[PDB]
């Protein structure tokens, strides 16, 4: 483990997603609200599926190693399956907020499939050049996520309770704010251009994810917004 | 990429999924009814799952070798990634056209599931004998799905709108015929006999694949069966 | 086939796995309750797809070998491709026979998917300490589905219709003494400590995998609770 600079980082995500976890479990308990309990479960599930992923790579089993550059580069693909289960729940936090319509869920959590599938080919591909075709592709598809977030959910939201219509433009602005740093750390780090050493990358993507999945869940469970209006 | 043959099939098949992505995209625009918008979430997906795979086959990274017949046989596995998210869409665009309960639409995309998953497991199977093994079990997981879109949706669709009736009818049709086609280009393609080379067996797949995703997408909407009756 | 010592029980598994979903299908045909059609579809996909992995073991498709204690240990991974979509869809059919909530369903299937996830990298990471890490993870997740099915359905059972309540409590008994067989035969046998041989962990994994698929579906199928109330 040790042996591994961006080891402390590792170690460290590992417990504020398991902390994590176990604060949301702990807090939905005293919960029967039915429109509650769905948040709870979408928002709980998020850091226990990135515990799980963090942990496989602190222990080494999410790791491989690539050539490209004529280098051996070392690459953590645990993060892509982390992210494909994870990004989607997220996006139905939000989507249920504002009662979407369904066909506007589908198209939003199958951009964001696409985002994610294709950032893991862009990961894993040999060709040096072709790496950063995938990372267009995959910018493409959460620009699409990002437009939709903005001009379908917002004015969706204000014709909605006050507090859920304030509650989703604060969670709206924190996703949009911390998704957009994930491709650019990408291009600058390890998996491009290279510029920023893996130890470093391994920081900055750990204070985005417990920021995107911790932080947004602690905003989103303390709003009344996720109660059903009751007497 | 030019080293390959069948290069020029997968490049045409790239631009011809993207071409189709678009039209789909702008046309959806202007688009409000919740139900229309359910079709065209899901009939634009297709050509955009569809469009990543062929350009990773057109670059490499779709494509490995499989030893069978004393040989190293070049097996494109992008397919099946395509196929096993977008042909349970297809048949979801049929079963919504005619209100299908849900009993069945799971039994739909389970078998679908299986039909795609055996598929793969006989494309990458090292014992010749037994890839054929595969190909029955994925053909019997096939025919049960034309069973239920023959003796089980077109009765739904009778008792439904003339306009949704028709438009089924027609999609149901091009369905049957061209899926149809599907385990007879591998059973005498690369992946089985061997009779058609590559190059000739990728051609025959692009056609099909654009025949059945953007031709079925363009009648789709272009139909009124996919709004609400409204004044 | 007949190289391996264990062959027998899979070939055994695989007749009784087809055989199972013969009868269900045949059984399901007149059938036209929208209600029973749902527990008919979810209830022959399960033998059916572990119809298919059993098969893949038997012709040698889905078994690997995993370097740890010095050796190449024999791992079927079949096993976890089969159980990650089989035991999400046995644990509908008992949310669906209460009428459970989505947010409840929504923590059962996820917490499922962690527990089968995190007991497929326990049998293939190599550090042999390791293997135990995961298995007391999915140990964790599989008391919290426990929990869930007894403490929060069993309540929600009482409060229906008396002949869906005696059949759920007769299906929540069965599942949670098999289930729980699971994660012993695991520990004991080539995955774990190695106290048992392989022919034998196969054996008893048929034994349990037979009567939790095959033997559940049948008490199920023939209970009344799977019709709605109708004159
Ligand atoms: C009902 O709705 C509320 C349940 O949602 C909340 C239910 C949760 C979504 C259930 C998922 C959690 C499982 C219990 C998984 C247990 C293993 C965890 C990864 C434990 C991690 C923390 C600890 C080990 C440090
Ligand atoms: C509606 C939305 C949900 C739609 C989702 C959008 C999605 C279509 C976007 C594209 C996803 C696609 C790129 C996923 C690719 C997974 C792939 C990286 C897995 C590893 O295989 C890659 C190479 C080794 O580098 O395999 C070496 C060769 C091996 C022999 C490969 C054989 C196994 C194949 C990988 C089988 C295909 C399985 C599916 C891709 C599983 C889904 C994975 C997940 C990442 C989508
Ligand atoms: C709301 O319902 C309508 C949206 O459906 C339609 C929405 C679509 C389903 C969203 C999916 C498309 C994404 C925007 C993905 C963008 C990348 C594409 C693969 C681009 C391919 C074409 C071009 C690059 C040639
Ligand atoms: C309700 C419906 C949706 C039900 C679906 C029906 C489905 C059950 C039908 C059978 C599907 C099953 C055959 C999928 C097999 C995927 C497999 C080809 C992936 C590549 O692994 C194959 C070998 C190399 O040839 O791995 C070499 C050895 C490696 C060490 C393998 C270890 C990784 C395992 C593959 C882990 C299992 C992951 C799941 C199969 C992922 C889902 C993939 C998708 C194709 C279903
Ligand atoms: C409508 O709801 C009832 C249909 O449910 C029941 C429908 C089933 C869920 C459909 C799934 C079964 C498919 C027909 C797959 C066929 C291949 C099977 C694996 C065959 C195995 C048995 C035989 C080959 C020994
Ligand atoms: C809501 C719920 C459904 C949430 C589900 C809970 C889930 C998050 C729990 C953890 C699941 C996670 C451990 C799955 C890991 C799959 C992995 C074993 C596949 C084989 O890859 C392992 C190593 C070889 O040993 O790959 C060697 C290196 C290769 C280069 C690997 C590159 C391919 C990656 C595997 C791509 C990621 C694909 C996804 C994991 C596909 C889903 C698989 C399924 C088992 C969940
Ligand atoms: C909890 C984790 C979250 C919210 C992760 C979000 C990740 C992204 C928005 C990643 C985006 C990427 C691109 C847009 C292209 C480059 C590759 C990715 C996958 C990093
Ligand atoms: C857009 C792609 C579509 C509609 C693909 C459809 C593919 C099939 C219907 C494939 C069927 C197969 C069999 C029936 C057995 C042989 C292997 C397959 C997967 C080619
Ligand atoms: C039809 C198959 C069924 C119902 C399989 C159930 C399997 C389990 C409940 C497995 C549980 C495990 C653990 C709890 C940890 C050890 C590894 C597993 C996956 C065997
Ligand atoms: C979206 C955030 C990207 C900003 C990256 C800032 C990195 C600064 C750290 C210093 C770079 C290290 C280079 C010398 C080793
Ligand atoms: C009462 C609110 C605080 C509860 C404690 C939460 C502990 C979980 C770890 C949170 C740290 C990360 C927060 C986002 C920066
Ligand atoms: C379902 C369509 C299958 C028909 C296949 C027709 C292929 C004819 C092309 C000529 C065969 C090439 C053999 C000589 C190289
Ligand atoms: C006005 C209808 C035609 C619009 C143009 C569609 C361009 C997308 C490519 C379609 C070519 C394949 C059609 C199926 C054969
Ligand atoms: C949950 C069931 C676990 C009980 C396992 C009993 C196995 C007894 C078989 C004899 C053990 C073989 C050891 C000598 C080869
Ligand atoms: C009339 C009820 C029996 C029908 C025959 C069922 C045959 C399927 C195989 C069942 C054997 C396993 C039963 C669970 C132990
Ligand atoms: C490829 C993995 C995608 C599935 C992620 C799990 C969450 C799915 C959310 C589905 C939302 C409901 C759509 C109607
Ligand atoms: C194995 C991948 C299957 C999932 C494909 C994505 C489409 C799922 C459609 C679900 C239809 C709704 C069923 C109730
Ligand atoms: C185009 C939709 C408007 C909202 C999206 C904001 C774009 C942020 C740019 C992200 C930069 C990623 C490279
Ligand atoms: C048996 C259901 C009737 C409709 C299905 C038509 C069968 C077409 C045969 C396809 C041939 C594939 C090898
Ligand atoms: C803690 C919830 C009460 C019901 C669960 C029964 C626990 C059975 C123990 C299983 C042993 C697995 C190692
Ligand atoms: C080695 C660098 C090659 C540059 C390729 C950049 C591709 C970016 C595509 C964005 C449209
Ligand atoms: C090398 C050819 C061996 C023939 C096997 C055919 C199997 C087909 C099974 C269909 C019932
Ligand atoms: C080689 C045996 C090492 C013992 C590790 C046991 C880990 C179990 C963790 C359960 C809390
Ligand atoms: C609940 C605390 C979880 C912390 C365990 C993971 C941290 C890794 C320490 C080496
Ligand atoms: C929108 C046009 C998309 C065409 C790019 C893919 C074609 C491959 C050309 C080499
Ligand atoms: C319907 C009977 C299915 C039996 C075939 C599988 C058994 C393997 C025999 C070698
Ligand atoms: C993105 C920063 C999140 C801050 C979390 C603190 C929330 C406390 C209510
Ligand atoms: C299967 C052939 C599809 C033909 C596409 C043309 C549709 C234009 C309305
Ligand atoms: C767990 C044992 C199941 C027994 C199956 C027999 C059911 C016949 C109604
Ligand atoms: C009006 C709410 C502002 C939230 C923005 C937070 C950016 C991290
Ligand atoms: C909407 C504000 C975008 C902020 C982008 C920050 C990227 C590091
Ligand atoms: C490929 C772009 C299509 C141009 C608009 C078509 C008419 C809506
Ligand atoms: C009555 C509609 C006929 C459609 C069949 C088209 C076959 C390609
Ligand atoms: C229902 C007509 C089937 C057509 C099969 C064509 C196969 C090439
Ligand atoms: C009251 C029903 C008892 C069912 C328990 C069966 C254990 C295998
Ligand atoms: C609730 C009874 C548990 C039985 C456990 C059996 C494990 C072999």
Redesign the interface.
């Known amino acids: 483990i040790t042996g591994r600079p961006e080891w402390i980082w590792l170690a460290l995500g590992t417990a504020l997603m398991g902390l994590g976890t176990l604060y949301f479990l702990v807090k939905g308990m005293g919960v029967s609200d ?1 429109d ?7 928002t ?2 998020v850091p ?2 990135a515990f ?1 992923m963090y ?2 790579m602190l ?3 999410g790791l491989t190693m690539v050539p490209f550059g004529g280098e051996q580069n070392p690459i953590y693909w645990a993060r892509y399956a982390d992210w494909l ?1 994870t990004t989607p729940l997220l996006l139905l936090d939000l989507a249920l907020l504002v009662d979407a ?4 869920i ?2 939003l959590v ?1 951009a964001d ?2 985002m994610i ?2 950032g893991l ?1 862009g990961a ?2 040999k ?1 040096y050049s ?1 790496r950063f ?1 995938w990372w267009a ?1 995959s910018t493409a598809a959460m620009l699409y996520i990002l437009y939709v977030l903005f001009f379908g959910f917002t004015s969706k939201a204000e014709s909605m309770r006050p507090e859920v219509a304030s509650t989703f433009k604060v969670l709206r602005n924190v996703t949009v704010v911390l998704w957009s740093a994930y491709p650019v750390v990408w291009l600058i780090g390890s998996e491009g251009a290279g510029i920023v050493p893996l130890n470093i990358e391994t920081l900055l993507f750990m204070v985005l994810d417990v920021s995107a999945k911790v932080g947004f869940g602690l905003i989103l469970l303390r709003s009344r917004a996720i109660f059903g209006e009751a007497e």
Chains 1, 2, 3 share one sequence.
């Not at 509650?36 to 979408?42: L, P, S, T």
């Not at 319509?101 to 506007?104: F, I, R």
């Open positions: 039915p509650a309990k769905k948040f709870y479960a979408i709980t599930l226990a599926i799980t942990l496989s222990l080494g089993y289960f319509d369904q066909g506007t589908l198209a199958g499939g696409i599938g294709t080919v894993l591909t060709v072709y075709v592709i």
